[PDB]
Amino acid sequence: GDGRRKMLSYSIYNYLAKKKYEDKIVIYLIEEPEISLHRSMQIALSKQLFEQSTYKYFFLSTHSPELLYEMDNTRLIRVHSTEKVVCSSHMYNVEEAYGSVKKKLNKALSSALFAERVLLIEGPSEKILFEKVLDEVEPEYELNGGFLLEVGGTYFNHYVCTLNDLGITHIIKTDNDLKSKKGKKGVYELLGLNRCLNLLGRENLDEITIDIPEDIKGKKKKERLNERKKEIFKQYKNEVGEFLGERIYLSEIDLENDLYSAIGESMKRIFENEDPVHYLQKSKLFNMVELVNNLSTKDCFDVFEHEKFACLKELVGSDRG
Amino acid sequence: MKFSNITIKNFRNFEKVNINLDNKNVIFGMNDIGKTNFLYALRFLLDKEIRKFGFNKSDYHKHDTSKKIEIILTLDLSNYEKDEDTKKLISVVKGARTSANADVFYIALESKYDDKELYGNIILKWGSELDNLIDIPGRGNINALDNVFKVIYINPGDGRRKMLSYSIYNYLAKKKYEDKIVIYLIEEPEISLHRSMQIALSKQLFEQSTYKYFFLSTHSPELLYEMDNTRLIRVHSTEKVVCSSHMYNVEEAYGSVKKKLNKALSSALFAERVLLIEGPSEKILFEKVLDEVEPEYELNGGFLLEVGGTYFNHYVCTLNDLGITHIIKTDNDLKSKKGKKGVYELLGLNRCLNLLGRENLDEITIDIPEDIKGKKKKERLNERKKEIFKQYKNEVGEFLGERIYLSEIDLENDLYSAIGESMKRIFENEDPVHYLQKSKLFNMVELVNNLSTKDCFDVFEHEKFACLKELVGSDRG
Amino acid sequence: MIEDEMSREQIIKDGGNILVTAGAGSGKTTILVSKIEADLKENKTHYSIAAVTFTNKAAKEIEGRLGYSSRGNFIGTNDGFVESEIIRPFIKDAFGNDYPDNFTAEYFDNQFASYDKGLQVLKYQNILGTYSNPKKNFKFQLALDILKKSLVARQYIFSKYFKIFIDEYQDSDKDMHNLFMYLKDQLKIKLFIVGDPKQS
Ligand SMILES: Nc1ncnc2c1ncn2[C@@H]1O[C@H](COP(=O)(O)OP(=O)(O)OP(=O)(O)O)[C@@H](O)[C@H]1O
Ligand SMILES: [Mg+2]
Ligand SMILES: [Mg+2]
């Protein structure tokens, strides 16, 4: 048959390299090892290729994202598809702080290494909304080398340094958050602004505090936190402009307030409430599916040619000039 | 008009295998299991260049050469009007059709070994009944089956030459074979192909009308990103060769989320045991626990599938018709209705009851004082979820018998039931559950940064996390 | 250029029913084989044509003028076309398995002139006779009866046969005209009829 003959031939070559060539320096040159191979055998070959010490020196050409699931301490070379043949090199390492989330990062980055323009989103609600909008506007976005990459609970530097060293265009759409500290009441740290300032090459900002009355909670406490986020986004305006020059797109409050700025009369029509923003934020997965089941054409274009959604126009690549 | 069935008896690794078919068939499976021996059964039936050499000793089941090789194909033929291919079949056959059985057709292949000339002669037949199959008439090297079907077999600088050769094969099928029924047999088209070209081949193969009939064998999940109106065939890796079939369709209710479902399910079709979870927080926690306990789980055929904002029926029907083990871990939720205050619906219990084969329950109504909000409202809702989980106990037991695992309140309360001393140690609060539930994507990373060995085992051998022991597959018996 | 090429564009590129008011003979065979080779040139699908004559000498002369065709085009007499295309593949599907498949036309002994005694001597003696009236056709009436009876015969001659080219219509019976009208009106087959100016 196939496959097991190829995996037999790998063990024949590794047995001949272990036995006959103890006195020599062995370099493997592997040309496309995913051919006629199951993906579980690709993950097994990836674990043997990056974890074991029997492949000390190799050069690997591949087309498969599932065979880069175990990558660490390697050198990634990308050949660019431009008019001049440019090779870009990156020394890929995974840090000791990221060792508990290593497999998630390697699967997500290993699918994204074979792209040209990568949009970095937070969770699956952005994936549902942007897949509906990019299905209705430009449905061949992934044929042309676009990618959607959900990066949750991380500080963006690993993905941006790996894609920036390889010549792959990274776009980040995010929002500024006020995370409450553990063991402390009333003191909120600026999460999204420190993530974007850490991407720009700055230090982390100081922990701000805001005081509320104790009976004031519920929807009113979220409105006080929203106007506090609006005052932070107003006062740090020249940092937001140089985030915007470096393809970092910070929202004022959330994604939902930008969507209410774009398609908010349709959101009042669908949800039939006076607060369509709060109703989607009560349950984010089920109400985004309920919203994208009821949008159509000329709502997705209202999302796409809005000024708060220029990350999608960067991802497609259509320019006026 | 339409393929319906193929029955393969006493061939190379098929003893008696019956497969329901359609147009646009996609077959998948493991290595050395018989994917390309399925396509050689179609080459020996319908292509003359394979059929002219006969059968060897090695084409018989377990080198026996005393049984008869029999390959029978069933055609549907129910639409005589408006389809030109039914007229293309009916104008050649002329004498074995019956008006009482005018909406079925059979093309059969028989072979008995000689064991003097050392040769297996192939005799082809058609008919409209399974008894009285007359021989296909022919003169010389040409019979009348070759006047109907034309079989194009595709098997692969590089890359751009193969996509040129696809256009050469489609140009020759558009120009020279207008009067014939064309069947494509494609054997692994992901070889030396970039993944954008695989998505482009998937879109051309499933959306355009230039591939009316094909049989596709593949190993690549990116070439099933656009699958719709197809027949999925899985060859099982057991001690007996079993082929399962599913008629894959995407509903009109799921048409706005079709690409997300197709990417998530197309990665999950190449597995053996699939766990269905809700979001990425379960993915982060289960990837940390399965990294610490059984780190070769995806080598052995396990898969973590995040499904969100759906009703579980599409994935369970596709994985259950293909013979793939599906495990669902979920939690019961009280979703608030739009335009109505105080009336909730029982969302996780309705999802499990819709999976089991029942109807949705009635909308419950719980009322609260208006000043009582914040953390006390969530405690009243958790006590209402506990009363729902206590009163529907015999439904929860038969969810548990069908590998559905419904939580009492949430994942986080089960995690506090397992490792909650360590959750008190890490978060240093009196409420470790609520601090985890404030920012879910950042405190789960903060939690799994600080766990180690014997906390992941306390997650793993707990009785509220038997879905992980189902996903790995380790049994005491 | 001008009216000669315009008249050739009219008389070559037709697609409908053809009825030419021309005499018997006088070069009709050359324009018939020119129409047959123009219809074989102009067709690109899987359909096939039929040619019906009376004598075997004109049939082998037409087979000499065409040569070889691999499209399944039938050229022959009317009794051979009815016997090999209508009667023999569909008698077992129309009237059951009691009637024989193979049969020979021997009309030198039986002179029976009724339909009921004809059907009981195909049932019992398994041979066919001829009528005492010479303006009769038992085989064409049997072909019309089993084309009215069978569904798959109508499906086969709707799927295969496209046009029928008829020669020597001046000496014909009304049953052949009834069967050709039954092929014309329902199953959509064009007709090419040559004839006579007056009497002859
Ligand atoms: N005559 C025979 N008798 C018994 N077993 C046979 C015979 N011919 C083939 N086989 C078996 O059938 C299998 C042939 O593998 P095959 O190439 O069909 O698999 P596959 O699923 O297409 O593989 P891959 O995924 O690696 O491309 C082997 O297990 C072989 O032992
Ligand atoms: Mg194979
Ligand atoms: Mg190459």
From Swiss-Prot, chain B:
<comment type="function">
    <text>Component of antiviral defense system Gabija type I, composed of GajA and GajB. Has no detected ATPase activity. Expression of Gabija type I in B.subtilis (strain BEST7003) confers resistance to phages phi105, phi29, rho14, SpBeta and SBSphiC. Expression of Gabija type I in E.coli B (strain ATCC 11303) confers resistance to phage T7.</text>
</comment>
<keyword id="KW-0051">Antiviral defense</keyword>
<dbReference type="GO" id="GO:0046872">
    <property type="term" value="F:metal ion binding"/>
</dbReference>
<keyword id="KW-0479">Metal-binding</keyword>
<keyword id="KW-0378">Hydrolase</keyword>
<feature type="binding site">
    <location>
        <position position="412"/>
    </location>
    <ligand>
        <name>a divalent metal cation 2</name>
    </ligand>
</feature>
<dbReference type="InterPro" id="IPR051396">
    <property type="entry name" value="Bact_Antivir_Def_Nuclease"/>
</dbReference>
<dbReference type="InterPro" id="IPR041685">
    <property type="entry name" value="AAA_GajA/Old/RecF-like"/>
</dbReference>
<feature type="region of interest" description="Toprim domain">
    <location>
        <begin position="269"/>
        <end position="409"/>
    </location>
</feature>
<feature type="binding site">
    <location>
        <begin position="32"/>
        <end position="36"/>
    </location>
    <ligand>
        <name>ATP</name>
    </ligand>
</feature>
<feature type="binding site">
    <location>
        <position position="278"/>
    </location>
    <ligand>
        <name>a divalent metal cation 1</name>
    </ligand>
</feature>
<dbReference type="Pfam" id="PF13175">
    <property type="entry name" value="AAA_15"/>
</dbReference>
<feature type="region of interest" description="ATPase domain">
    <location>
        <begin position="1"/>
        <end position="240"/>
    </location>
</feature>
<feature type="binding site">
    <location>
        <position position="282"/>
    </location>
    <ligand>
        <name>a divalent metal cation 2</name>
    </ligand>
</feature>
<keyword id="KW-0540">Nuclease</keyword>
<keyword id="KW-0460">Magnesium</keyword>
<keyword id="KW-0945">Host-virus interaction</keyword>
<comment type="subunit">
    <text>Homotetramer. Forms the core of the anti-phage defense complex. Interacts with GajB; 2 GajB dimers dock at opposite sides of the GajA complex to form a 4:4 GajA-GajB assembly (GajAB). GajAB interacts with Bacillus phage Phi3T Gad1 protein; this interaction forms a 4:4:8 GajAB-Gad1 complex and leads to GajAB inhibition.</text>
</comment>
<protein>
    <recommendedName>
        <fullName>Endonuclease GajA</fullName>
        <ecNumber>3.1.-.-</ecNumber>
    </recommendedName>
</protein>
<feature type="site" description="Interaction with GajB">
    <location>
        <position position="94"/>
    </location>
</feature>
<feature type="site" description="Interaction with GajB">
    <location>
        <position position="97"/>
    </location>
</feature>
<dbReference type="GO" id="GO:0051607">
    <property type="term" value="P:defense response to virus"/>
</dbReference>
From Swiss-Prot, chain C:
<feature type="binding site">
    <location>
        <begin position="22"/>
        <end position="29"/>
    </location>
    <ligand>
        <name>ATP</name>
    </ligand>
</feature>
<feature type="site" description="Interaction with GajA">
    <location>
        <position position="152"/>
    </location>
</feature>
<feature type="domain" description="UvrD-like helicase ATP-binding">
    <location>
        <begin position="6"/>
        <end position="200"/>
    </location>
</feature>
<protein>
    <recommendedName>
        <fullName>Gabija protein GajB</fullName>
    </recommendedName>
</protein>
<comment type="similarity">
    <text>Belongs to the helicase family.</text>
</comment>
<feature type="site" description="Interaction with GajA">
    <location>
        <position position="155"/>
    </location>
</feature>
<comment type="subunit">
    <text>Homodimer. Interacts with GajA; 2 GajB dimers dock at opposite sides of the GajA complex to form a 4:4 GajA-GajB assembly (GajAB). GajAB interacts with Bacillus phage Phi3T Gad1 protein; this interaction forms a 4:4:8 GajAB-Gad1 complex and leads to GajAB inhibition.</text>
</comment>
<comment type="function">
    <text>Component of antiviral defense system Gabija type I, composed of GajA and GajB. Expression of Gabija type I in B.subtilis (strain BEST7003) confers resistance to phages phi105, phi29, rho14, SpBeta and SBSphiC. Expression of Gabija type I in E.coli B (strain ATCC 11303) confers resistance to phage T7. May be a helicase or contribute to GajA activation.</text>
</comment>
